[PDB]
Amino acid sequence: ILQILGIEATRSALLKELRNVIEFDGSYVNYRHLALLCDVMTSRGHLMAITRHGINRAETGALMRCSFEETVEILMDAAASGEKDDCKGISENIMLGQLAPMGTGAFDIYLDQDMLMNYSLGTAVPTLAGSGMGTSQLPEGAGTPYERSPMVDSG
């Protein structure tokens, strides 16, 4: 069908030919997941099969492949060429212990310091606010006793 119709044609062919496998009779069908298997097969042109190993591809370095097994050769060969692995992999990743991009690991977090800063008041002032003579021999005065900075630095 790929040789004589479309490539798009042949996708529809899969979808149909898989339904006819798990439906007769009374069978748990979801058009969504069926849909996905097909697009994966016909998403790179040729019909990528799924034999006990995982689409005989090869574009994500070795580290990853080593997971699909069987390792060996792969490393014994890839080594002789220094194959860079962006480690964008998900099994390559659960191999190193780095946190994997498994959905809930597919994002990072920081902190909204902004909230902690402007955060609600705030209710008092002012004396204590800008002082420095309640014991600490040292002085202060908020910050305006007659002194600059930068300028000099620039010069």
Binding site: L99, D108, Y110, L111, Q113, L116, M117, Y119, S149, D153
Partner: protein
């Protein structure tokens, strides 16, 4: 001496999130970098805190609970290089050389690198190296020309000579 921009990461702990983190991050920075030394940048005299202090980030750690705050800062550093002429302050004088001292770095002037006009006198009140009227004791900044420097354990150490013209007693 140089005024340069350096980086440093501060790994803060939940206990100190409060509402004035900015201050904490700055306080921690001054403490971790000031006084330190590296072969790459040398002695980190001090950090030009205020205005010249950037606080980017940060991203909290997954399995730790600590957040990493990258910080860009301006600092005064003292890095020496072979061939540089500097004024130093003599500290000790032994029949082994001249234990000078420039700022925070220690410079050693091997006796073999000292003119043949400065004989070593151990009998003289305070061990010195006169000639030659010129008397270099434990109190006479000399001029030397760094011949070689080394960096062993963040610390730096080099040797200077007095063989060229316009070097020596100051």
């Amino acid at each position: 001496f140089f005024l340069k921009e350096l980086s440093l990461t501060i790994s803060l702990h939940p206990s100190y999130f409060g509402p004035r983190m900015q201050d904490y991050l700055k306080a921690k920075l001054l403490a971790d970098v000031e006084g330190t030394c590296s072969g790459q940048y040398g002695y980190i005299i001090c950090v030009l805190d205020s205005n010249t202090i950037d606080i980017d980030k940060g991203r909290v750690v997954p399995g730790q609970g600590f957040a990493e705050f990258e910080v860009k800062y301006r600092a005064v550093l003292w890095r020496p290089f072979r061939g540089e002429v500097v004024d130093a302050i003599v500290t000790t004088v032994n029949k082994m050389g001249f234990f000078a001292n420039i700022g925070p770095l220690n410079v050693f002037v091997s006796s073999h690198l000292v003119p043949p006009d400065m004989k070593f006198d151990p009998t003289a009140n305070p061990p010195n190296y006169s000639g030659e009227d010129q008397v270099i004791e434990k109190g006479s900044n000399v001029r030397l020309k760094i011949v070689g420097t080394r960096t062993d354990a963040t610390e730096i150490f080099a040797i200077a000579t007095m063989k060229e013209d316009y070097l020596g007693v100051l």
